[PDB]
């Protein structure tokens, strides 16, 4: 099992107490490590979070809800999968990481099984949004990979709407 999933430049959205923030997951980790400290955890390090919340998607009902984030994790990884969207945006995640696609309806699919032509799923203005994949490949990454752990539902919604799953 793994507790890290996302490249360091993955943008996140969250609220601390009531105050919204958008920044990269490495920027978030640095901010809260300074504030809260780091705990050795698994094969890397974790920063505990107090009063931090995200938006999350229930894929069965389509309901968007608010739920807490428990901690941010990081560990170094050699190789990631880069899923590039026709927009030029790229999702860079570990190869087994579940990615939300629309195939036979909404389905979580391991990143390395995502194909050009698949549609990655996000939600915006309450509605599902579909983004065609332009290319996939393994990349040499060799750096910190992160997760923002969401215990209730195991996903958080990024600023661009993509529904990002926690590491497994």
UniProtKB/Swiss-Prot annotation:
Q: Which domain of life is it from?
A: Archaea
Indicate what this protein is called per its UniProt record: Pho RadA intein
Recorded source organism is Pyrococcus horikoshii (strain ATCC 700860 / DSM 12428 / JCM 9974 / NBRC 100139 / OT-3)
